[PDB]
Amino acid sequence: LSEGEWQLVLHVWAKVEADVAGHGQDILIRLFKSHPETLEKHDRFKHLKTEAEMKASEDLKKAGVTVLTALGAILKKKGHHEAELKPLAQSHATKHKIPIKYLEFISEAIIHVLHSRHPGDFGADAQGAMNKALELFRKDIAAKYKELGYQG
């Protein structure tokens, strides 16, 4: 990414940072409604059925913050994220077993929610820059997954 692309990424991300939990809820609900098989990975809250139930769930709201806190720290490294990716790849490859396809689904949900909430900060410029940043994340985590023996 260019420096200007990174800045577009971080500018919209500052919006997310004003209310991380609410953004996390909207992203995870989007992911689970669009790709329900992904919900199966979350043993604590895989029984949830309705949008209202998902919004009321403390565990889901915690999970959304967990994701976005880690992702935000990754984005802020502007591609220099090997040290932050290392523990994430370790758990997601060997413990949780999250295939790349699911990381594509959550990337799609992130993009969907940013476009829905912050369209003035998410025009084609910013969309394209966030797409690149999330693609780079997936490329690099996929290489780490393979290093660890997981072809997911």
The site for ligand HEM (CB under 6 A) is made up of 38, 41-44, 66-67, 70-71, 88, 91-92, 96, 98, 102-103, 106
Considering only CA atoms, which of 102, 100, 93, 80 is closest in space to residue 147?
93
Shortest distance in whole angstroms from residue 97 CB to ligand HEM: 9
Nearest to ligand HEM of 4, 41 (CB atom): 41
Q: What is the DSSP letter of 1?
A: -
Shortest distance in whole angstroms from residue 66 CB to ligand HEM: 5
What phi and psi values does residue 123 have, to the nearest 5 degrees?
Answer: -75, -170
Nearest to ligand HEM of 28, 126 (CB atom): 28
Shortest distance in whole angstroms from residue 50 CB to ligand HEM: 19
Shortest distance in whole angstroms from residue 116 CB to ligand HEM: 18
Nearest to ligand HEM of 67, 114 (CB atom): 67
Compute CA distances 146 → 79, 105, 118, 119, 142, whole Å. Answer: 19, 20, 35, 36, 6
Q: How far apart are CA 125 and CA 132, in angstroms?
A: 11
The string of DSSP codes covering 123-136 is SHHHHHHHHHHHHH
Q: Which residue is nearest to ligand HEM (CB)?
A: 91
